[PDB]
């Protein structure tokens, strides 16, 4: 369902949305910055309102048998957002659902190394005398990782709770691994490890009590 | 300037009536068209319908027999009602002005044209989550900083039910480098998430990092200060 | 896509058909006009089922009116009146003899005379009995009235095969917008022509009289509408915007809604119904209104 178009800064980006044109169209384009509200970019095929630079152009709604194309000249880092389209065709009913968006990405991303972070249990939880090791995994593509905890050199069998990968408006997938232990278990072994196996590599980070 | 503000309950029980309100400032609600657009997490915006004076008001055929719109010209605001809500209505509802246009392709006189609508000035938007639950509260624990010139710092929301939990930093004064991870459903039936922030190690300050944890089903507002 | 006032007009009919072999049938669809079909108790039928047979016009021939000179054999002659005011009955002062008449195009049309001979000087009014209101009044123009008729429905010809040998040309899908045929008449030209005709009408029905124009009172489609042929298609245009006036003793185009019929029975003929094959491409035609 999701699509991506990666364009080098300063080049020209092209975005395809919606089905093929059947009659005279009036495609309305919208831009949705991550974490913000969709903003109007081009209405009536290729008419831009006040505030939108002339770098954003849309395909004329007079060509029968072609898809809606959004051309973005002089691609800059600020244009990295989602783009949706509202197809207004004279042969199709009123579309109450925007077309599937296309993500515009800054040039370059061949693979993403997972960024693991291991946190020891807090002193406030240790006074409530509960323990949980946290292994945060982010900025990894594709979303398919396996977490294996280690007590010194011995693997940990139970107490492992791992989330399912989930991308967030980028290639960055999210994954959290928790390991519930007791205050006696934490002070027992010398150090604990969080070995995360992603694709072909395995990153290992440790933690030692104080 | 045209300022739009959306506001609703935020939590609506199943099979209830969702009521939202779009406070408009800068213009009158009688001289413009008003449309509502909702958007689930990770999906494309779905047009709900447009309302205008003189009875010109249309809805979405898929939600035709459940949605109701109105315009309060005395209080200058836009209202919204959605009867028989389900889990599919949990989304971010936006309120936007609507300008009409006429696409002419034929000879005009033979009605060989069609009117297209487009929203130009949107609002901040409101979050609506549909859930029916008994209670419970979360336990927030600070994650002490530990390690290039950079350092990590975060919080942990342990044992809560149900989703979600809104976690902000310094009352929203830190949005660069914040990564909130999705919670995990343990075998006990309680969720638990974590939120980390990549900050430069040069933080003698003390640059007070206080994470704000909010859990609406329990009215949970927890301010936790993270210190090395 | 709607509204409810568009009344369809075009119907998308699906039906059986005999193929080349006399065994398996053929589930094919076509696109007929409402004037061509009629429901029966949605199931429809051709409007000419319980009237006569039907034959499809061959796509090779054309219905283009070409000038035809009528000539007389040896021993005969054709007399021609060459006066500028011959209102067409009685002695003619300047008579000439000819063997063959000028090129007369057989343009079959009603109400509006198309592609005819222009009159000389003043527009001419001819009637067998002016006091008789049952005899038609043929009006001949001096200046031609420019009329433009178009078919904004550039169509597809499906060649479905009713073998062995025979082949029916159905109407495929429409490429573009669903538009209806229409005819333009220049408002200024129509005003000057009507104002020039009413001045000749006052010479026979009293000098100081009121002449009011109304469209047809009713009947068949061939009389209530401007029936004619253009590009192979048979148009029937609404002439209610031309004959809607009231003249006392003393800048755009007028568009008229035109319908299209494929199954016709012209000359009030029963026994032979002709199916006009669909014509590909937008049909545009510019003609001269030279009389009424
Ligand atoms: C018999 O009489 C009848 C009735 O008198 C005649 O009917 C006429 O039929 C023709 C077609 O046969 C129609 O032509 C079509 O007209 C539309 C509408 O044109 C008018 O509106 C335009 C839009 O106006 C708004 O937008 C502009 C631009 O921002 C604003 O400035 C305005 O303020 C408005 O807000 C307007 O732009 C037009 O002006 C331009 O065009 C005319 C005509 O060519 C010129 O004279 C002008 O000088 C000026 O250049 C006009 O005012 C057109 O939009 C149609 O063109 C589009 O569609 C074609 C088919 O779909 C397509 O191929 C074209 O490329 C063009 O598409 C372009 O524009 C679209 C919209 O902007 C884009 O989406 C698209 O991608 C592409 O960029 C078409 O020309 C007449 O409207 C119609 N007249 C009436 C009164 O009904 C008939 O012709 C007569 N003769 C016969 C039957 O023989
Ligand atoms: C009253 O009097 C006027 C005055 O003539 C008359 O107008 C004439 O209208 C008809 C339409 O009914 C015209 O005949 C057609 O014209 C079109 C368009 O002309 C263009 O092409 C030529 C090419 O050189 C140009 O010079 C010209 O300026 C135009 O640009 C032609 O395309 C038509 O050609 C086809 O149709 C004929 C009949 O169907 C065929 O016999 C002919 O061979 C052509 O057929 C082939 O080509 C088709 C093209 O697609 C193809 O699809 C076919 O399958 C086939 O292979 C046709 O000639 C004419 O142009 C008008 N007169 C003038 C002077 O322009 C009115 O019709 C008349 N009114 C009445 C009621 O009779
Ligand atoms: C009225 O409705 C009819 C319906 O038939 C339309 O006719 C078709 O129109 C389309 C669009 O012009 C034609 O598609 C064109 O095909 C060309 C190639 O065709 C040849 O090659 C194929 C094999 O590839 C053969 O099968 C075929 O028989 C031909 O021998 C393309 O080259 C065309 O592209 C070029 O022209 C278009 C503009 O037309 C440009 O935009 C392109 O960039 C490119 O330069 C085109 O794709 C189709 O062939 C027509 N069919 C018939 C049967 O004629 C009319 O177009 C339509 N008219 C109007 C005014 O609406
Ligand atoms: C596709 O179909 C829809 C649905 O019918 C079309 O929308 C309809 O458009 C007409 C014309 O604008 C509307 O009629 C209106 O009625 C009100 C009644 O008060 C009147 O005030 C208006 O002036 C107008 O005449 C009709 O309400 C509207 N229907 C809906 C459900 O919105 C639409 O135009 C068609 N085409 C496209 C491209 O959507
Ligand atoms: C029929 O169509 C023709 C062609 O478009 C029209 O003639 C045009 O008239 C305009 C206005 O006077 C001129 O600017 C063009 O140069 C003319 N073109 C040609 C080819 O003659 C004519 O006016 C139309 N008539 C009607 C009644 O619609
Ligand atoms: C088209 O559909 C409508 C709605 O069902 C129906 O009432 C009508 O009879 C159909 N046909 C035409 C020609 O409108
Ligand atoms: C023909 O029409 C009949 C209607 O009874 C239908 O059952 C059949 O599928 C159609 N097509 C053919 C090829 O018979
Ligand atoms: C028609 O022309 C007559 C005579 O010149 C006139 O009195 C009248 O105003 C004209 N009609 C229009 C609509 O121009
Ligand atoms: C005349 O116009 C009337 C509308 O006033 C219409 O009902 C009638 O069908 C028209 N008749 C002809 C012959 O055009
Ligand atoms: C002809 O046009 C007139 C005026 O629009 C209309 O009242 C009448 O009903 C039309 N006649 C037919 C048969 O459609
Ligand atoms: C005829 O013209 C008169 C005067 O403009 C107008 O009031 C009337 O509606 C017209 N009739 C039709 C059928 O259009
Ligand atoms: C029809 O009228 C036009 C307009 O003057 C003229 O150019 C054309 O020659 C006329 N056609 C004839 C007289 O056959």
Author numbering:
A (entry chain K): 6 to 9, 11 to 67, 67A, 67B, 67C, 68 to 95, 95A, 95B, ...
B (entry chain L): 1 to 82, 82A, 82B, 82C, 83 to 100, 100A, 100B, 100C, ...
C (entry chain F): 137 to 141, 150 to 185, 189 to 309, 312 to 321, 321A, 322 to 398, 411 to 452
Manuscript excerpt for this entry:
Since the disulfide bond between residue 501 of gp120 and residue 605 of gp41 (i.e., the SOS bond), used to create SOSIP trimers, is located near the base of the trimer (Binley et al., 2000, Garces et al., 2015, Pancera et al., 2014), we sought more central locations for a second intra-protomer bond. To assess the impact of an extra disulfide bond on the trimer structure, we expressed the BG505 SOSIP. The overall architecture of the trimer is indeed preserved upon addition of the 72C-564C inter-subunit disulfide bond. In addition, bNAbs against three distinct sites of vulnerability (PGT122, N332; 35O22, gp41/gp120 interface; and NIH45-46, CD4bs) interacted with their epitopes in a similar manner to the SOSIP.664 trimer. Thus, the added H72C-H564C disulfide bond preserves the native-like trimer structure. The finding that cysteine residues at multiple positions in gp41 HR1 can pair with gp120 residues 72 or 73 is consistent with the flexibility of this region (Lee et al., 2016).
We have described a soluble, recombinant Env trimer, BG505 SOSIP.664, that is stabilized by a disulfide bond between glycoprotein (gp)120 and gp41 and an Ile-to-Pro substitution at position 559 in gp41 (Binley et al., 2000, Sanders et al., 2002, Sanders et al., 2013). Negative-stain electron microscopy (EM) and cryo-EM studies show that it closely resembles the native, membrane-associated trimer at the structural level (Lee et al., 2016, Lyumkis et al., 2013, Sanders et al., 2013). The BG505 SOSIP.664 trimer, and others of the same design based on different genotypes, displays the epitopes for most bNAbs and few non-NAbs (Derking et al., 2015, Huang et al., 2014, Julien et al., 2013b, Sanders et al., 2013).
